[PDB]
Design an enzyme around this catalytic site. Structure first.
Site, mmCIF file in Angstrom:
data_model
loop_
_atom_site.group_PDB
_atom_site.id
_atom_site.type_symbol
_atom_site.label_atom_id
_atom_site.label_comp_id
_atom_site.label_asym_id
_atom_site.label_seq_id
_atom_site.Cartn_x
_atom_site.Cartn_y
_atom_site.Cartn_z
ATOM 1 N N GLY A 155 41.170 27.879 10.036
ATOM 2 C CA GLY A 155 40.972 29.039 10.888
ATOM 3 C C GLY A 155 39.989 28.660 11.980
ATOM 4 N N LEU A 156 40.481 28.381 13.184
ATOM 5 C CA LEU A 156 39.578 27.993 14.260
ATOM 6 C C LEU A 156 39.366 29.135 15.240
ATOM 7 C CD1 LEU A 156 38.122 25.232 15.012
ATOM 8 C CD2 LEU A 156 39.684 25.210 16.944
ATOM 9 N N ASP A 178 45.300 26.019 11.905
ATOM 10 C CA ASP A 178 45.328 27.407 12.346
ATOM 11 C C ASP A 178 46.709 27.626 12.958
ATOM 12 O OD1 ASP A 178 45.035 29.907 13.578
ATOM 13 O OD2 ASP A 178 42.896 29.558 13.938
ATOM 14 N N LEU A 213 41.190 37.431 6.222
ATOM 15 C CA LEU A 213 42.032 37.604 5.043
ATOM 16 C C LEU A 213 43.142 38.567 5.439
ATOM 17 C CD1 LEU A 213 42.699 37.329 2.037
ATOM 18 C CD2 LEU A 213 41.020 39.124 1.582
ATOM 19 N N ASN A 214 44.379 38.081 5.432
ATOM 20 C CA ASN A 214 45.517 38.913 5.799
ATOM 21 C C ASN A 214 46.592 38.947 4.713
ATOM 22 O OD1 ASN A 214 45.848 36.166 7.843
ATOM 23 N ND2 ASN A 214 47.439 36.588 6.320
ATOM 24 N N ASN A 217 47.663 35.231 3.431
ATOM 25 C CA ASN A 217 46.786 34.197 2.890
ATOM 26 C C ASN A 217 45.934 34.558 1.685
ATOM 27 O OD1 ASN A 217 44.888 35.782 4.235
ATOM 28 N ND2 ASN A 217 44.586 34.304 5.897
ATOM 29 N N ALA A 239 34.084 33.113 4.548
ATOM 30 C CA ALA A 239 35.059 33.993 5.177
ATOM 31 C C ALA A 239 35.314 35.238 4.311
ATOM 32 C CB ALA A 239 36.364 33.228 5.417
ATOM 33 N N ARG A 240 36.235 35.138 3.362
ATOM 34 C CA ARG A 240 36.532 36.270 2.485
ATOM 35 C C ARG A 240 36.857 35.820 1.068
ATOM 36 N NH1 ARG A 240 34.113 38.993 5.084
ATOM 37 N NH2 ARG A 240 34.574 41.004 6.077
ATOM 38 N N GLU A 269 32.745 41.586 -5.532
ATOM 39 C CA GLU A 269 31.379 41.713 -5.040
ATOM 40 C C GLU A 269 30.856 43.100 -5.400
ATOM 41 O OE1 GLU A 269 31.107 40.702 -0.824
ATOM 42 O OE2 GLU A 269 32.354 38.927 -1.170
ATOM 43 N N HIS A 289 26.838 37.457 0.144
ATOM 44 C CA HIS A 289 27.506 37.929 1.350
ATOM 45 C C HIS A 289 26.446 38.226 2.425
ATOM 46 C CE1 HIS A 289 31.543 39.737 2.559
ATOM 47 N NE2 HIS A 289 30.798 39.786 3.649
#
Ligand SMILES: NC(=O)c1ccc[n+]([C@@H]2O[C@H](COP(=O)([O-])OP(=O)(O)OC[C@H]3O[C@@H](n4cnc5c(N)ncnc54)[C@H](O)[C@@H]3O)[C@@H](O)[C@H]2O)c1
Length: 326
Positions: A155-156, A178, A213-214, A217, A239-240, A269, A289
């Site tokens: 992921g850039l 990416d 996060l989609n 993925n 990231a997530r 979390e 986080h």
């Protein structure tokens, strides 16, 4: 005036001066939907929320006047924006405030894995006495030379690019994957790009996640994917959580297939070293986080979120919005 509520928070001091003559502000300090008082559900025209609460279609349907949600942060995967869009609810975020903070925290975790500063400090907290060179080498066993190592960025985007630029200065080779970027993006930045996730994992000594996060993925890193990584590779994730299958990671760390991991985010979390799949995983560094945080970033995003709310109530939705993600 219109009612705007901070869903999962209690402090509204930064937002008040910006929304004083615009909306009545209230907070819920809710961890879930069932903790949001009836008044909000019925009258709230706008909502401000962080990343600790999730809004599904069912939750969104409970609001009767809500016209806008503003995430005080960049990630909006904790909201079903598609359903929000169906319910006529605009969703926005604050993408820029914590880019550098997150990239710097990412580099901190990467360096902690390679230089073992956190583990060396702890070894000292536990009373380990390191008098001779032999002892130094043993306690610092695993500390590695960075120059020549390959850092694989997944992921850039804003954070990925910031990490790539910082990584270059330490002599890291950087590579990135990416699938959504147009071609040529890698040239302007002088980075190497790979066409698939497997290629990135195969060639990287340290893998860092920086993608949103989609729907495509979730668990990008799983039992199948983890096997494509180099033996003794490092994994960093700011990231997530949920992009990573904790169960696959735990085993890998236990088996030594993954030398170490640094996680600021987790599938569940708040995180706890006594609960979950990472229960007793070795070589694990974690943070609550907090990669996004700095006093300046916090204030910056809160004031921006407040202004976006102000634009939505005073202007036209979604025309007056600067960061609606639809
Ligand atoms: N833990 C924290 O404190 C913190 C703070 C800010 C951002 N983040 C997270 O970091 C991530 C990056 O944010 P930016 O850097 O602000 O976001 P961004 O939107 O600018 O970039 C995300 C990039 O990921 C790419 N991407 C999406 N799916 C991908 C996939 N399957 N494989 C490879 N690349 C993929 C996108 O095309 C995009 O270029 C987000 O998930 C965000 O939520 C975490």
């Amino acid at each position: 005036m219109p009612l705007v509520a901070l869903l999962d928070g209690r402090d509204c001091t930064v937002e008040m001066p910006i929304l004083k003559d615009v909306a009545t502000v209230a907070f819920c300090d809710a961890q879930s939907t069932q903790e949001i008082h009836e008044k909000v559900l019925n009258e709230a025209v706008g909502a401000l929320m962080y990343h600790t609460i999730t809004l599904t279609r069912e939750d969104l349907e409970k609001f009767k006047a809500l016209r806008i949600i503003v995430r005080i942060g960049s990630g909006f995967d904790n909201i079903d924006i598609k359903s929000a869009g169906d319910l006529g609810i605009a969703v926005c975020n604050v993408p820029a405030a914590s880019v550098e903070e997150t990239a710097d925290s990412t580099l901190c975790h990467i360096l902690n894995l390679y230089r073992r500063a956190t583990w060396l400090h702890q070894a000292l907290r536990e009373g380990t006495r390191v008098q001779s060179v032999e002892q130094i080498r043993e306690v610092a066993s695993g500390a590695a030379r960075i120059r020549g190592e390959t850092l694989g960025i997944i992921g850039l985007g804003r954070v990925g690019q910031a990490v790539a630029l910082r990584a270059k200065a330490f002599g890291f080779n950087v590579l990135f994957y990416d699938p959504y970027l147009s071609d040529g993006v890698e040239r302007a930045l002088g980075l190497q790009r790979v066409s698939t996730l497997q290629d990135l994992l195969f060639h990287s000594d340290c893998v860092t996640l920086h993608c949103g996060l989609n729907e495509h993925n979730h668990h990008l890193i799983n039992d199948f994917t983890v096997k494509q990584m180099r033996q003794g590779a490092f994994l960093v994730n700011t990231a997530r959580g949920g992009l990573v299958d904790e169960k696959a990671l735990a085993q890998a760390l236990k088996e030594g297939r993954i030398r170490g991991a640094a996680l600021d985010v987790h599938e569940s979390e708040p995180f706890s070293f006594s609960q979950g799949p990472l229960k007793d995983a070795p070589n694990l560094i974690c943070t609550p986080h907090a990669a996004w945080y700095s006093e300046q970033a916090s204030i910056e995003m809160r004031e921006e979120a407040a202004r976006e709310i102000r634009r939505a109530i005073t202007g036209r939705i979604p025309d007056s919005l600067k960061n609606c993600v639809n």
